[PDB]
């Protein structure tokens with residue numbers, strides 16, 4: 336039921352090195368009602384391959400986007416970390432490129448519309464595009480105009496006709512979720528004026544490799560992207576990569592700016608620097624990806640044995656957060672409700688549900704606080720700093736966290752960290 340990849344999404348070649356294969360795995364954002372059995376739970380092959388031409392890393396299969404996104408789960412309350420990062424995105428886009436007030440900003444994958452709201456607060460006109468009908472209706476209700484559609488060449492034309500030429504087109508994380516990136520590039524080209532920019536924020540393949548972030552591999556994430564593969568793609572569609580900012584968010588990301596090849600925006604030197612860096616760090620060599628694969632095997636084994644060793648000693652263990660990536664981690668490690676008695680999560684609709692595959696219960700933070708947990712496995716480790724900042728009481732009582740990457744570790748460490 337999920338379609339197999341043939342040619343490379345970015346460059347069009349067909350020379351794939353196998354990197355890792357996790358077998359059939361259930362969908363990471365498909366949380367389940369508790370039940371006696373889960374025999375009909377859908378599973379899809381989860382494996383990654385590396386294109387030797389441009390070094391896009393890609394999943395072997397594309398799960399149907401209508402199935403994934405047409406009813407996507409959301410939250411109505413964004414954390415201060417998320418709000419701060421959304422404010423920073425605005426600041427970078429507007430200040431780095433001198434976007435005047437009253438300019439038009441189009442966002443692909445605009446979701447609840449919070450990122451657009453931040454652009455409006457900075458004095459911009461906005462429009463969103465997001466296929467999740469449930470989420471789009473919420474955004475529209477709040478006053479953030481949103482087209483309940485997938486981005487395409489045809490939607491691009493409808494936008495230009497009714498809303499004009501955007502000074503900025505933004506895609507936050509969504510770009511790695513789209514199979515037909517060639518169509519996106521074409522719709523963008525049509526939309527862009529001479530000094531318009533297309534900006535995309537995606538997890539950075541360099542960081543993913545170096546920090547062993549294999550839990551970010553899940554079916555929604557079709558692509559795992561470095562600057563090289565984006566240049567290869569945009570070359571073929573009259574677009575030029577003009578600038579890149581590296582960011583610590585989501586385990587290391589890149590915010591990439593793209594313009595018309597013959598437009599006003601000059602290419603900054605950082606672009607070539609990052610491509611040279613990617614070469615230098617071995618992204619074009621088979622050994623690198625074989626090295627990634629064994630790190631994964633090593634971390635997976637070590638993590639499982641740590642949890643089970645602590646359990647055998649009579650320590651109680653739970654998951655902190657129930658993010659999509661947590662479900663890759665737990666499934667790949669083969670952990671069950673005997674290993675983690677629950678996963679706490681602040682997202683209301685998740686509370687009372689059960690995790691895909693492992694079927695571990697999801698409970699509220701307020702339930703979590705009634706329980707004498709000794710260790711929390713930090714599944715939402717990309718928010719480690721914000722989480723640790725508010726878990727003083729737990730830490731003071733001798734509670735500990737297990738961090739899965741770069742290697743498995745225990746917080747707090749045995750000595751003060753100052754080196």
Ligand SMILES: Nc1ncnc2c1ncn2[C@@H]1O[C@H](CSCC[C@H](N)C(=O)O)[C@@H](O)[C@H]1O
Pocket residue numbers: 400404405407443444445446464465466467470484485486507508509512513
């Ligand atoms: N081809 C496509 N065009 C536009 N939006 C898409 C899309 N595929 C998925 N999406 C939307 O993008 C989001 C998935 S990505 C989630 C990241 C989101 N931008 C955020 O930071 O909050 C969902 O809201 C989904 O409905």
Ligand SMILES: [Cl-]
Pocket residue numbers: 508556
């Ligand atoms: Cl994502």
Ligand SMILES: [Zn+2]
Pocket residue numbers: 343344345346347348386387388389390391
């Ligand atoms: Zn390629």
